[PDB]
């Protein structure tokens, strides 16, 4: 069966995962049919991106998600949408963008002067 898996990238103690469509038999770090997303658990909130157009196609043809990929598809709303259930908007959290560096430079200029 063709499945949607996490493949491990990154270095020791820094697991970064790509969301890939691959045959069940293929080894984890093996050739993938498509990369449809990425998942970085070490972040807060863990980084999640999914190409929803491709996720819908692959679930349509019958790709079977793995357990963690199924959790991610529910957060993104791609699972609920594919099935017809509600919640398609999803509950995806995004990291608050840190203050821009230029603005903090202006802040320091004003503060001291």
């Amino acid at each position: 069966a063709v499945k949607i898996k996490l493949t491990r990238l990154g270095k020791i103690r820094n697991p970064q995962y790509r969301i890939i469509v691959a045959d069940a038999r293929t080894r984890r770090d093996g050739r993938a049919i498509e990369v449809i997303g990425r998942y970085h658990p070490k972040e807060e909130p863990s980084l999640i991106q999914i190409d929803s157009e491709r996720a819908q196609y692959w679930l349509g043809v019958g790709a079977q998600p793995t357990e963690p990929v199924l959790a991610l598809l529910k957060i993104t709303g791609d699972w609920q949408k594919f099935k017809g259930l509600p919640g398609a908007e999803g509950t995806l959290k995004v990291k608050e963008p840190k203050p821009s560096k230029l603005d903090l430079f202006n802040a320091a200029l004003a503060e001291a002067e």
Binding site: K101, L102, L104, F105, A108, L109, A112, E113
Partner: protein
């Protein structure tokens, strides 16, 4: 590693001021040792080599790290000599020296290494840390009243502060508006000889 041996003998061999406040250099501007007076045969290689030695023993960078700096400078789109100089100028121990909070680049290194500075609110004790545009460098609370740093506050004036740096507060807060262009950088060295040395 670091070079921790005598500092004057290096400036004496190279015939130029590295610390620039050194009385023992001006007293004996000839190279060190028994034969330091004797006539040395000229060669282009010795000239190129000594310009490299002036660079790396001014900033306190080992040859391994300095050669990586060269490759980056040559890779960068500008002219290699300007890129190399401003990369070494971006070093945090150098920025601290240019700001005035230290007496010597050796003193600047020790301070940064011992954990007295913060960059954009995060502690950095890496002397080779390269500052970028709009970096803000601050002093931790414990080291603000620290006796040599107190000296540094009321010893402002030893050297001039370059335009890309700016000390804005009595907290001794350093701002970097940009990386220095070659004109901004003022160093007793001919950079074109080092580019030629590594093209050998």
């Amino acid at each position: 590693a670091r070079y921790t041996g005598p500092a004057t003998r290096k400036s004496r061999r190279l015939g130029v001021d590295l610390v620039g406040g050194d009385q023992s250099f001006e007293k004996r501007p000839y190279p060190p040792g028994q034969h330091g007076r004797a006539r040395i045969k000229e060669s282009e290689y010795r000239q190129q080599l000594q310009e490299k030695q002036k660079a790396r023993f001014s900033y306190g960078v080992m040859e391994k790290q300095f050669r990586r700096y060269y490759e980056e400078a040559n890779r960068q789109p500008g002219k290699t000599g300007d890129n190399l100089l401003r990369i070494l100028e971006s070093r945090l121990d150098n920025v601290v020296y240019r700001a005035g909070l230290a007496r010597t680049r050796r003193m600047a290194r020790q301070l940064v290494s011992h954990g007295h500075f913060l960059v954009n609110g995060v502690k950095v004790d890496i002397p080779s840390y390269r500052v970028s545009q709009y970096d803000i460098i601050d002093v931790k609370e414990k080291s603000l009243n620290t006796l040599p740093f107190q000296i540094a506050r009321e010893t402002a004036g030893e050297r001039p502060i370059p335009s890309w740096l700016q000390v804005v507060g009595e907290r001794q807060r350093i701002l970097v508006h940009q990386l220095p262009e070659r004109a901004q950088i003022d160093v007793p060295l001919t950079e074109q000889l080092i580019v030629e040395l590594y093209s050998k």
